[PDB]
Design a protein around this ligand. Sequence first.
Ligand SMILES: [Ca+2]
Ligand SMILES: [Ca+2]
Ligand SMILES: [Ca+2]
Ligand SMILES: [Ca+2]
Ligand SMILES: [Cl-]
Lengths: 112, 111
Amino acid sequence: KKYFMSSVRRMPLNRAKALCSELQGTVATPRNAEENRAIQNVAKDVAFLGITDQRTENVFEDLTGNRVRYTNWNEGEPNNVGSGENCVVLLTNGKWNDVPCSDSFLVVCEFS
Amino acid sequence: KYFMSSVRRMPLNRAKALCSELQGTVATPRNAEENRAIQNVAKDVAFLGITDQRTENVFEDLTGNRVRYTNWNEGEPNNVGSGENCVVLLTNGKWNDVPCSDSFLVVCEFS
Ligand SMILES: [Ca+2]
Ligand SMILES: [Ca+2]
Ligand SMILES: [Ca+2]
Ligand SMILES: [Ca+2]
Ligand SMILES: [Cl-]
């Protein structure tokens, strides 16, 4: 089964990736509503998910380059504001928001 | 409990910081079953969340609880040199006390 754990400190996606990979896990990528809720359970605040549209704008993939199926975008998202928002966070209501990969948020790691 | 191993080596203070960052702790086997599980996730010698830093030869977990189950390698713990107050799980599953300043892999434990 997948197990999700939340970080205590906030950091940009690249550091979030490094943190989860340090324990041989990955940044949490919910594949369905059950997993999305499981991530909500552990994230006490806005937290990074392992999804990006860095390759092609508006084509969201997990960190292994696998195009995602399930999405739970907050109304109005993804909006790619300004210079670009190519990373994704799980808001406190469980919905998603695309944000700059360089911005800092808690991270939820996934292990199985 | 879920056990995960790090890929890089680091001293105990950094190991504690890593496990704590994801709200866990350095793995502390409470019986032979947990000891084997940690051994299996660790690909090389790794730190356990046990030390005798507070009182020499009184081994406790990182929350101050004295440990009951132990699996010391023959001749251990020997507190050699200027002192060894940290503990590692060897590749055969037995334990060895080592300097906390030394670098080893870390196995984190989560509930
Ligand atoms: Ca984008
Ligand atoms: Ca947005
Ligand atoms: Ca000692
Ligand atoms: Ca020793
Ligand atoms: Cl020491």
